[PDB]
Amino acid sequence: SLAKLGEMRTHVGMVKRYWNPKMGFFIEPERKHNNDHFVLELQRQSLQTAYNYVKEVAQNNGQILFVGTKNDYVKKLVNNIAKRVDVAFITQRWLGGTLTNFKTLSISINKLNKLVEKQAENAADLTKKENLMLSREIERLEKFFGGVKSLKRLPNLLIVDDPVYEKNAVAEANILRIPVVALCNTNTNPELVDFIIPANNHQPQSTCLLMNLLADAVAEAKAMPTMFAYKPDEEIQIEI
């Protein structure tokens, strides 16, 4: 099965006594070691349900958004996922007012497309100073819109790396009617996320496993070969 319990060799663990007791229901009895390990059957069930939901939304020709903005690592994970398998992504900080309003971003993305097309058509027919200024403007527009330039409507579903760090983003998502999914840390509300996935968010390796599994969930629905497709073996990749 997907994410076999044997693969969960290092997946559980949380910060020492910083938790909402509403995750007491979705966790093991409180461990003395202050690192409350997790229940594997419920996380397996939730990951499978997320797998099916992503399958369905991809079948109905939908688009999903990826957000990852921790210190150095998760942004790199999302970047590697983006360039590896096609998916809508945001690598830099989610801006206040990025989902509840689209016109203010539709103008920006359309201007980005128009000026990048012009730059492709601009073959030094303008002055070098103005060309460099335009290139800097394109970099400015792309460094906040790293992946949102190919979708022209609202996303049907999206994942969140940390619900306590996309607080504005998740609040805006709950304002609208679209469902959301995230690696729900044990410091949230069991209402801000429609599909609860309890896991670690400060340990890089578990985040790696789950981001890769969800990327595969959206990929295998694209008629694209994947590696975690009911494969009992696993892989070794560590932070540095």
Binding site: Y53, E56, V57, N60, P179
Partner: peptide
């Protein structure tokens, strides 16, 4: 929202 069709 189990179903999506």
């Amino acid at each position: 929202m189990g179903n999506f069709d």
